Every structure is written in C-alpha cells, then in structure tokens.
Amino acid sequence: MTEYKLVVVGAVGVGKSALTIQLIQNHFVDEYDPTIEDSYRKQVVIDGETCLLDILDTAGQEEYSAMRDQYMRTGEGFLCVFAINNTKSFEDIHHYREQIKRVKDSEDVPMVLVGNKSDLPSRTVDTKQAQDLARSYGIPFIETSAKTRQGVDDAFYTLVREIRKHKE
Numbered sequence: 160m161t162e163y164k165l166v167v168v169g170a171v172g173v174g175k176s177a178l179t180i181q182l183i184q185n186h187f188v189d190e191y192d193p194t195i196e197d198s199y200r201k202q203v204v205i206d207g208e209t210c211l212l213d214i215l216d217t218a219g220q221e222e223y224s225a226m227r228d229q230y231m232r233t234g235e236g237f238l239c240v241f242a243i244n245n246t247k248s249f250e251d252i253h254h255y256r257e258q259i260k261r262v263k264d265s266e267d268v269p270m271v272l273v274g275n276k277s278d279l280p281s282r283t284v285d286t287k288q289a290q291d292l293a294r295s296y297g298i299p300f301i302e303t304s305a306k307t308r309q310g311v312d313d314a315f316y317t318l319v320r321e322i323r324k325h326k327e
C-alpha cells in the first residue's frame with residue numbers, strides 16, 4: 160500500500176489539531192492543546208486506490224530549530240497553514256520558505272497554502288492578497304473553514320494530486 164509521510168507545520172493560533180481531528184475522527188475541538196509529537200494515520204481512497212496517510216503534528220513554535228531542519232529533509236508535501244485573521248502567521252511563510260528551499264535543496268517543491276478560520280468574521284488577509292504571495296512562490300491557495308468543515312476534505316486531495324504529478 161502507498162504510504163504518504165507528511166508533516167503538519169504552522170504557528171500557535173491557526174488550528175493544527177483542529178484540522179487533523181476534524182478529518183481523522185470528524186470532530187472539532189474549541190480548546191487548544193500545545194502538541195509536541197504524535198503520529199496521525201488514516202487510510203484514504205483516492206482515484207480508486209486505498210493509501211495510508213502518516214502525518215506528524217509537531218510543535219508550532221521555533222523551539223526545536225535543529226529538529227525543524229531535520230524532518231524538513233522530507234519535502235513530500237508541506238501543509239502551509241496560516242490564519243486569515245493573523246497577518247503575522249501569513250508573512251511568516253517567507254521565514255519557512257527560505258529554509259524549506261535550503262533543506263529540501265530543490266527550488267521546485269509541491270506545497271499547498273491553506274488559510275484557516277475562513278468562516279470567521281475576523282478577516283485580515285484577503286483571498287486575492289494571499290493568492291498574490293502564493294503565486295509568487297508558485298503554490299496554490301485553498302480555503303479551509305475548520306469550524307464549518309468546508310473544503311477541509313477536498314483540499315487534502317489537492318495536495319495528493321500534486322504529489323502524484325511530481326512523481327510522473
């Protein structure tokens with residue numbers, strides 16, 4: 160069976176486990192829990208093929224810099240999640256971008272920019288603005304409304320399509 164090794168990156172206040180738990184057990188949690196390390200695995204049927212998705216939810220802080228540069232060597236699919244309400248987490252993508260290209264040692268890497276809390280009234284970053292920077296890097300921007308569970312499942316398939324095309 161085809162297994163996909165992905166890492167869940169981001170900052171504190173975006174919705175890390177809010178995406179995982181919502182797609183894994185279909186549950187939305189209001190309380191935020193500072194995660195350090197764990198393994199989330201689930202089987203998904205795409206294009207008639209059943210595959211296993213292994214996602215590692217690491218600390219959403221620049222605490223373990225050495226460890227950050229470690230797992231970044233596996234650039235299968237980077238989930239660039241940010242909060243549309245927090246511009247700081249959006250402009251933080253560049254901070255990771257400069258490192259990603261260094262660790263991956265490749266200019267071309269299939270990544271997906273997903274904005275969370277899109278169903279929330281508090282919006283600072285606009286879709287066009289987000290897409291402006293996204294297209295600057297060469298990555299697509301998707302809307303991920305966690306609370307309503309809209310686009311969360313579909314957006315997960317988009318990255319798989321990228322990985323498949325990056326192969327052959």
Ligand SMILES: [N]C1=N([C]C(=O)[N]C2=[C][C]=C(F)[C]=[C]2)[C]=[C]S1
Pocket residue numbers: 164165166197198199213214215230231233
């Ligand atoms: N989770 C866990 N495991 C599995 C794996 O591998 N994962 C991953 C990899 C890489 C990346 F990047 C992300 C995720 C083992 C132990 S714990």
